[PDB]
Structure 1
Amino acid sequence: AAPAGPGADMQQRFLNAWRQRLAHGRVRWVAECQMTAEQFMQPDNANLA
């Protein structure tokens, strides 16, 4: 995002702006919970490809 307005309220912009598509799904990284070769296996990693 390009910045908008002062920095003083910039959270309450982005708090309410991503109030919707944040509890939607997950981010691309989940692999901090994933052990190694759980990435190498065909399930549990749609981001393998």
Structure 2
Amino acid sequence: AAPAGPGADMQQRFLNAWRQRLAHGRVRWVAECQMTAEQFMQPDNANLA
């Protein structure tokens, strides 16, 4: 995002702006919970490809 307005309220912009598509799904990284070769296996990693 390009910045908008002062920095003083910039959270309450982005708090309410991503109030919707944040509890939607997950981010691309989940692999901090994933052990190694759980990435190498065909399930549990749609981001393998």
For the criterion TM > 0.5, the same-fold answer is: yes
> TM-score, normalised to structure 2's length?
1.00
How far the C-alpha of 1:32 sits from its partner, in A, is: 0.0
How far the C-alpha of 1:5 sits from its partner, in A, is: 0.0
Unaligned runs of 5+ in 2: none
Unaligned runs of 5+ in 1: none
SS at 1:14 equivalent? helix
Aligned CA RMSD, in angstroms, stands at: 0.0
CA distance in 1, matches of 2:2, 2:29: 24
How far the C-alpha of 1:27 sits from its partner, in A, is: 0.0
Cα deviation 1:5-44 (Å, max 9, x = unaligned): 0000000000000000000000000000000000000000
- Where has structure 1 moved over 3 Å in runs of 4 or more? none
Q: Does 1:35 align with 2:28?
A: no
> TM-score, normalised to structure 1's length?
1.00
Sequence identity, in percent? 100
